[PDB]
Design a protein around this ligand. Structure first.
Ligand SMILES: *[C@@H]1O[C@H](CO)[C@@H](O)[C@H](O)[C@H]1NC(C)=O
Ligand SMILES: *[C@@H]1O[C@H](CO)[C@@H](O)[C@H](O)[C@H]1NC(C)=O
Ligand SMILES: *[C@@H]1O[C@H](CO)[C@@H](O)[C@H](O)[C@H]1NC(C)=O
Ligand SMILES: *[C@@H]1O[C@H](CO)[C@@H](O)[C@H](O)[C@H]1NC(C)=O
Ligand SMILES: *[C@@H]1O[C@H](CO)[C@@H](O)[C@H](O)[C@H]1NC(C)=O
Ligand SMILES: *[C@@H]1O[C@H](CO)[C@@H](O)[C@H](O)[C@H]1NC(C)=O
Lengths: 446, 520, 109, 119
């Protein structure tokens, strides 16, 4: 049972101390670690530190965790990994940025989620809140074609019947001769945006001037634009839903423990097939029969499925859905399970865009009761988890037990004569409603 | 009041040429207090050592841009990777000269890379242009499954999207493969005969060897390859009449150096008229922030519209590449490369020489052979298609109608029951009825033969999900038609929108609707 | 490389009190919190035996009379009480830089 | 238990070539490095080279580069040292040592009997 001489390398801004890193059972193999802490990195300090670490001990792995927001550290780490044959994991900060294409001979794996997984989570939110009419605004930032193709294929193979009205690409310089017409074409309520944080400000300012931001319109943006949460520009409306990574509950000690677990488990599983474990180079200067790629597609650790995909991403990441409340801070709403999504707000509240210069009155609260053939109440179909297309959602307060007054707002589906009348009135008078069945009693008596 | 321009060149003579070019370019705009200076080094064999040498030497002198030369070694390309990474950390623009791989066009990975030679993907545009001139409209694309192959395939598909037409097939093999006859057979079975190739020298040699073995270089075959496949071993073992490409002055290092220095000097002078300008950072160690004005300088470099150049006006597209490069169109005429045309910046201008095609014909060949043996698929309906067992062995009892017309029959091979009942029982039978008479009339009129066989299961076709990958697929007759097991569905098939989206119907041969049957 | 040097080359000490040996290295042999230095004892006609690793931790299966301490570029080894075991030579090996190097040796009587 | 065994003493005319065999009989042979050492008559030690039996990777010292060759066979559990162009200064004892994969240093634990060559 040979051990692994893993080397853990972190940053000063984290409160982690070297003694805790050197102390931190249950791992299949023994792991003695070498820990050094360093501040902001540079393309020469990285290389000097890494070459020094490989001299004196046969380093067998590496766990690099940073704190800055520079997106060249990932590429430097990939280059070093492909030149020295050292399995490198990304943990936090700069290294966690997802690099799309890596060299075929590099063993660099990262913690994070790609644009496909972020798009899946956004579509899941839209389905769960019954927003089935939407548009799509993308600039010429790299990756927009992948984004659009994935969304189209996902929409074409669903049970819900998405009505994707438009696919807009603002390719000009916001000349207002074409971008203005393009943005006038949009009349839906849900808009997916894909651009860098610098272009997002301009587009949102233009949309606010045009009148596209209010109590009704909902904007959903990926983790690209809602980046560092300390810097919040003035053009972001309050209520901007975005998907990001879990920097709140995932402790750095948990991250480094999981890294050590993955490396030890992969080495242990590879020791059975071949009786030799992979090792680093003799030295950086001077002058790969089997690799670990096939041994990191299936790895299990404490019930948590830590398997990596065939491309270099996590199979089960930990995304988090965040919104920008009225206090100009990003507040966490719901998390991502192994497969499905949990939301804290069963009923989506209404957020005051900007200074809520125009208060809303078109949203009404409507109370009804079941008496066929005027109002009929049915349960929600579990096949699509959505009311069939000829009904409207409702909600009813059913108490779990009579001992306590706590209950749940069960969501059902309604239809009938009065409901057809109501939909016609909504289409004509142009208002929106919040239907719910009455709980206290029958029609009325004093 | 000085501006430096570093450059990592290969030969000392090339460094001298670079210094002289900088000194000469000092004059075209005049030599003010602003004066250009040149600092160069040479390549080194070890990537990690070079990535430190570039930082120390060039960055400690506060350079404004770096030029890379790509020395010729068996390590192929991916030589300017250490320079691009270190310089892109600080957002200092880099100009490439001879490296032509497609990976450097991706601006997510390489943040500040520009080059003056178009990559290996614009050959896709050249091929698409040549397709229109010669009216070929069916091709078989062959790809290496690597990044270069995927880039070429994506470029060609994007170009063909405008016509709203799909390429016939796109085969993908593995780099460094040994046996490819399995894929070449499936390539042979198709109608088209214009073969487009995109692979390295070793793969080109192997596919040429397999083509020679399988005798796929006769009349009607047209080959259409890139620049790599007409060098080295690929040109050593190449069937005649193969049409390649080339780049004019693409290996003229001195010309490229002069063009690059001119463009950089003009861009710097254009930038000097603007304000809010800082100075590049000094030293590899101790500085972590990016260059504040690096993106602005790169935008200025991208926006340049040069006029006076050795290869003409040089302008950069959106990805930071070269536009309007003059290629050459060659032909392998008896194991010799002879020019048969030149590709203008945006059109094709043929030469006066003779184009000897692989067979030897002096007339342009068209490769599109229609399949005159169709595979019909049909089902057991009540009044349209009857199914009857054979008499003794593959023969049908010849009955008579009441009108004196002998019943026309044709042997249809199909199963007895479904999979749960009959796992595998395929026996010949006898088919006759209405649709069979229609099929015989059509076959007589259009001059083609046929082979009638029944459908494996008993459904006309609907779209239903599969458990894994969460995707919808067709079944029944439609699934047999789309998968290639059939060519024509002669059966009582309804016309509706869901099927019309994926296949093309004909004018109806029967009009009717739905009704209810009850017991009386 | 690193060049070691042991002084004195030959030592004669009476039985009972103590014995001290030093081995000064040319460059610092500290590797991120653990100094790299080992001591050997080789009886004539036999392979050497490992005594101390990491310059401060004793090897299992050896009498407690053997000890070592030091830091940086200077290390020392002292034994007490002197007995009939300290008759062979001793060596110091560094493992900071490849290739590994050995000392000059020192006998006792 | 881990035990290592070598060949006998060697004595040839100057200018010949000799082989020294080291056999491992106590562990999984395809998992641990095998180092070679040279001992002159009681005035020091040096380092020759190492071989990983599993993957076959080999490292050498600069002084002994091009003079000695290390080859190992995964079937016979043997490690072969290939000396070339012996001279008057090659009369020394040769050991094969193997560490244990449990510590952060690179120490020598299990030692061979050693073979003495004379020219
Ligand atoms: C990194 O460490 C110190 C202490 O945290 C910090 O103040 C300084 O920026 C850096 N020091 C050195 C020597 O790099
Ligand atoms: C991974 O290996 C375990 C071994 O217990 C097995 O149960 C599981 O099915 C494997 N998963 C895959 C995807 O092969
Ligand atoms: C994992 O996913 C399955 C399927 O959705 C679900 O039944 C199970 O509760 C999930 N496990 C956890 C821990 O959420
Ligand atoms: C000018 O370039 C030369 C390279 O030949 C270099 O040695 C010198 O230091 C540079 N001077 C300035 C002021 O940049
Ligand atoms: C070889 O070429 C001839 C050309 O006449 C062709 O008929 C034959 O089928 C080829 N060989 C094979 C095995 O296909
Ligand atoms: C070469 O390319 C340039 C484009 O810059 C074009 O103007 C010129 O006509 C070309 N030369 C030809 C077509 O002979």
């Amino acid at each position: 049972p040979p051990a692994l001489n893993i080397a853990v390398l972190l940053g000063h801004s984290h409160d982690v101390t070297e003694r805790e890193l050197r102390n931190l059972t249950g791992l299949p193999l023994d792991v003695n670690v070498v820990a050094l802490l360093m501040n902001r990195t540079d393309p020469k300090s990285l290389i000097t530190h890494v070459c020094d670490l490989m001299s004196g001990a046969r380093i067998h792995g590496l766990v690099f965790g940073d704190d800055t927001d520079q997106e060249a550290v990932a590429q430097m780490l990939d280059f070093i990994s492909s030149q020295t044959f050292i399995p490198i994991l990304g943990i936090h900060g700069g290294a966690s940025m997802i690099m799309a294409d890596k060299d075929p001979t590099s063993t660099f794996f990262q913690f994070g989620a790609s644009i496909q997984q972020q798009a899946t989570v956004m579509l899941k939110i839209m389905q769960d809140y019954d927003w089935h009419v939407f548009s799509l605004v993308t600039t010429i930032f790299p990756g927009y074609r992948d984004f659009i193709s994935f969304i189209k294929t996902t929409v074409d193979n669903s049970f819900v019947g998405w009505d994707m009205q438009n696919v807009i690409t603002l390719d000009t310089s916001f000349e207002d001769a074409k971008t203005q017409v393009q943005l006038k074409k949009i009349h839906s309520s849900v808009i997916l945006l894909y651009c860098s944080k610098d272009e997002a400000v301009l587009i949102l300012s233009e949309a606010r001037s045009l009148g596209l931001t209010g109590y009704d319109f909902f904007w959903i943006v990926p983790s690209l634009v809602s980046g560092n949460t300390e810097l919040i520009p003035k053009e972001f409306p309050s209520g901007l839903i975005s998907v990001s990574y879990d920097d709140w509950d995932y402790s750095l000690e948990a991250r480094v423990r999981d890294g050590l677990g993955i490396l030890t488990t992969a080495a242990s599983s590879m020791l059975e097939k071949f009786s030799y474990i992979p090792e680093a180079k003799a030295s950086c200067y001077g002058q790969p029969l089997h690799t670990l790629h096939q041994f990191m597609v299936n790895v299990t650790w404490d019930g948590k499925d830590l398997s990596f995909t065939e491309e270099g991403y996590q199979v089960h990441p930990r995304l988090v859905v965040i919104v920008l409340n009225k206090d100009r801070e990003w507040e966490k709403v719901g998390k991502w399970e192994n497969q499905t999504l949990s939301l804290r707000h069963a009923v989506w509240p209404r957020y005051k865009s900007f200074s809520d210069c125009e208060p809303d009155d078109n949203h009404l609260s409507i109370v009804t009761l079941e008496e066929a053939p005027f109002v009929i109440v049915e349960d929600i179909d579990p096949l699509t988890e959505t009311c069939v297309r000829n009904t409207v959602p409702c909600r009813k307060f059913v108490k779990i037990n009579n001992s306590t007054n706590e209950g749940m707002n069960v969501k059902k589906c309604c239809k009938g004569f009065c409901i057809d009348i109501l939909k016609k009135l909504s289409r004509t008078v142009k208002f929106t409603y919040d239907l719910y069945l009455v709980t206290n009693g029958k029609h009325g008596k004093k | 009041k000085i501006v430096n321009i570093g450059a990592v060149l290969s030969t000392r003579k090339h460094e001298q040429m670079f210094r002289e070019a900088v000194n000469q370019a000092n004059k075209r705009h005049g030599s003010w207090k602003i004066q250009l200076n040149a600092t160069s080094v040479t390549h080194k064999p070890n990537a990690i050592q070079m990535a430190l040498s570039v930082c120390e030497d060039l960055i400690s002198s506060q350079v404004y841009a770096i030029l890379v030369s790509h020395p010729p070694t068996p390590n192929d390309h991916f030589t300017p990777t250490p320079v691009s990474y270190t310089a892109g950390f600080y957002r200092i623009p880099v100009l490439g000269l001879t490296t032509r791989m497609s990976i450097y066009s991706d601006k997510s990975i390489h943040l500040s890379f520009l080059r003056t030679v178009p990559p290996y993907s614009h050959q896709s545009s050249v091929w698409f242009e040549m397709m229109r001139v010669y009216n070929w409209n069916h091709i078989i694309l062959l790809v290496s499954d690597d990044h270069e192959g995927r880039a070429a395939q994506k470029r060609l598909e994007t170009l063909l999207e405008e016509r709203e037409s799909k390429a016939e097939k796109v085969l993908q093999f593995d780099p460094g493969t040994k046996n490819v006859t399995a894929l070449l057979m499936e390539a042979r079975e198709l109608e088209a005969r214009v073969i487009i190739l995109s692979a390295s020298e070793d793969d080109a040699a192997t596919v040429y060897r397999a083509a020679a073995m399988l005798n796929m270089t006769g009349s009607g075959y047209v080959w259409l390859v890139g620049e790599r496949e007409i060098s080295g071993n690929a040109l050593r073992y190449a069937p005649d009449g193969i049409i390649g490409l080339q780049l004019i002055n693409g290996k003229n290092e001195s010309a490229h150096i002069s063009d690059a220095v001119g463009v950089v000097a003009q861009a710097v002078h254009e930038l000097l008229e603007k304000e809010n300008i800082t100075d590049p950072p000094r030293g590899c160690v101790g500085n972590t922030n990016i260059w504040k004005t690096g993106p602005l300088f790169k935008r200025v470099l991208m926006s340049s519209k040069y006029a006076d150049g050795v290869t003409g006006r040089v302008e950069f597209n959106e990805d930071g590449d070269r536009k309007f490069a003059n290629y050459s169109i060659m032909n392998l005429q008896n194991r010799k490369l002879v020019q048969v045309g030149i590709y203008n910046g945006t059109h094709v201008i043929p030469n006066d020489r003779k184009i000897i095609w692989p067979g030897g014909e002096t007339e342009k060949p068209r490769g599109y052979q229609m399949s005159t043996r169709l595979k019909i698929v049909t089902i057991h309906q009540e009044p349209f298609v009857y199914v009857k067992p054979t008499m003794s062995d593959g023969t049908c009892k010849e009955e008579f109608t009441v009108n004196g017309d002998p019943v026309k029959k044709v042997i249809c091979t199909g199963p007895n029951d479904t999979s749960p009942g009959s796992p595998r029982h395929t026996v010949p039978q006898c088919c006759y009825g209405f649709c069979i008479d229609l099929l015989i009339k059509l076959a007589r009129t259009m001059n083609f033969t046929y082979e009638v066989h029944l459908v494996a299961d008993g459904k006309f076709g609907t779209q239903e999900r599969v458990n894994n990958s969460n995707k919808k697929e067709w079944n029944g007759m439609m699934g047999e038609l789309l998968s290639g097991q059939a060519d024509m569905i002669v059966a009582p098939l309804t016309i509706n929108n869901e099927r019309a989206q994926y296949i093309e119907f004909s004018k109806p041969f029967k009009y009717q609707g739905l009704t209810i049957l009850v017991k009386k | 490389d690193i060049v070691l040097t042991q002084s004195p080359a030959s030592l004669a000490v009476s039985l009972g009190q103590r014995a001290t040996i030093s081995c000064r290295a040319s460059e610092s042999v500290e590797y991120y919190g653990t100094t790299l230095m080992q001591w050997y004892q080789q009886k004539p006609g036999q392979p050497p035996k490992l005594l101390i690793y990491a310059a401060s931790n004793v090897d299992s299966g050896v009498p407690a009379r053997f000890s070592g301490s030091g830091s940086g570029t200077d290390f020392s080894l002292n034994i007490h009480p002197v007995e009939e075991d300290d008759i062979a030579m001793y060596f110091c090996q560094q493992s900071r830089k490849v290739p590994s190097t050995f000392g000059g040796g020192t006998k006792l009587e | 238990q881990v035990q290592l065994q070598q060949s006998g003493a060697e004595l040839m005319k100057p200018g010949a070539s000799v082989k020294i065999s080291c056999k491992a009989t106590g562990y999984t042979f395809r998992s641990y490095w095998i180092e070679w050492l040279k001992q002159r008559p009681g005035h020091g030690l040096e380092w020759i080279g190492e071989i990983l039996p599993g993957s076959g990777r080999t490292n050498y010292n600069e002084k002994f580069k091009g003079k000695a060759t290390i080859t190992a066979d995964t079937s016979s559990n043997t490690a072969y040292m290939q000396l070339s162009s012996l001279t008057s200064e090659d009369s020394a004892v040769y050991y094969c040592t193997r560490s244990r994969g449990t510590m952060i240093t690179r120490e020598f634990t299990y030692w061979g009997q050693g073979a003495l060559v004379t020219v």
